[PDB]
Amino acid sequence: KVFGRCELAAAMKRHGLDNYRGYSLGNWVCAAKFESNFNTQATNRNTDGSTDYGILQINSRWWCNDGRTPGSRNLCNIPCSALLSSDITASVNCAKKIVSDGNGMNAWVAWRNRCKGTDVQAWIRGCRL
Ligand SMILES: [Au+]
Ligand SMILES: [Au+]
Ligand SMILES: [Au+]
């Protein structure tokens, strides 16, 4: 599914991402925009052989098993295809774990390069939350 901006904001809000680890909702919406263009099905291969899955582009090197990422971990203990569902619960729950691990949202390259230090509240503007 390709979410609408305020549609994703609302769904991320109900799953408890708004100020989760101090990251306002706009950070999560901004990161999803630039990671996946709000598309739950987005998949992108990394140069290292891993693949990024879903609306928050969670990586197979560390977080999920896709069956083809040799020498890697599955710390969310999920097949990566679970990250492509139109229900974003699995992506969210895995991301809480990622963002909690000491590197915060800097684990998301699109966030660090396109969201961090920006006026991210603009991503939730006009949304009913
Ligand atoms: Au949801
Ligand atoms: Au949830
Ligand atoms: Au994020």
Side-chain angles (χ1 to χ4, degrees), residues 3-83:
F3 273 73
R5 176 170 64 84
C6 290
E7 188 193 12
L8 192 52
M12 291 181 149
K13 181 144 194 214
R14 58 157 291 232
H15 290 275
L17 289 182
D18 189 15
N19 287 302
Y20 187 90
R21 293 296 168 254
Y23 293 91
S24 62
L25 196 51
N27 286 288
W28 298 103
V29 175
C30 183
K33 172 63 183 187
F34 297 124
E35 281 296 350
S36 67
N37 209 6
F38 305 150
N39 185 5
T40 65
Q41 302 196 69
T43 63
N44 296 281
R45 193 80 185 248
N46 297 309
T47 50
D48 80 324
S50 62
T51 298
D52 280 356
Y53 296 84
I55 204 159
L56 299 180
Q57 289 291 275
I58 291 164
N59 196 326
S60 62
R61 176 66 55 207
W62 299 109
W63 305 105
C64 61
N65 186 171
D66 65 6
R68 67 178 205 186
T69 304
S72 80
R73 293 289 289 147
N74 178 13
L75 296 168
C76 297
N77 205 59
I78 41 159
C80 303
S81 46
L83 302 175

